Amino acid sequence: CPLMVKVLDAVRGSPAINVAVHVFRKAADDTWEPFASGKTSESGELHGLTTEEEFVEGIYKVEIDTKSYWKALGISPMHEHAEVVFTANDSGPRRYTIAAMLSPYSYSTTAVVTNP
């Protein structure tokens, strides 16, 4: 995969499973145009988002749905999504994995970028 997203639950120490994810690309007029979407697997991973020729140079946003993921805990989180923005391929053929560790009021994200 040119783009893969992986999500972990830092409260229970488990993959975050069946969670919705939306991907956008910034367009000419400055709006976020819809690019790809899905739900995470049993390992907290979402594979198969895009193709090598669809994944053109530009700026991308990843939105992970969190509103009710912690409902069973009794806590409402800081926002309805966890989100990251990244700039891609100003420089060539590269593959990206976006990794997120999530809690209701805190998260850590990392972009791992490799040249095949």
Tell whether residue 103 is a contact of a copy of itself (CB under 8 A): yes
Least Å distance between CB 111 and a copy of itself?
4
Decide: is 84 part of the binding site for Zn ion (CB under 5 A).
Answer: no
Neighbours of 68 (CB within 10 A): 10
8 near Zn ion, judged by CB under 5 A: no
SS (H, E, C) 20-52: EEEEEEECCCCCEEEEEEEECCCCCEECCCCCC
CA distances from 85 to 7, 22, 55 (A): 16, 12, 15
Nearer to Zn ion, 10 or 61 (CB): 61
Decide: is 37 part of the binding site for a copy of itself (CB under 8 A).
no
Q: Which residues bind a copy of itself (CB under 8 A)?
A: 8-15, 59, 73-76, 78-81, 83, 85-87, 89-90, 99, 101, 103-114
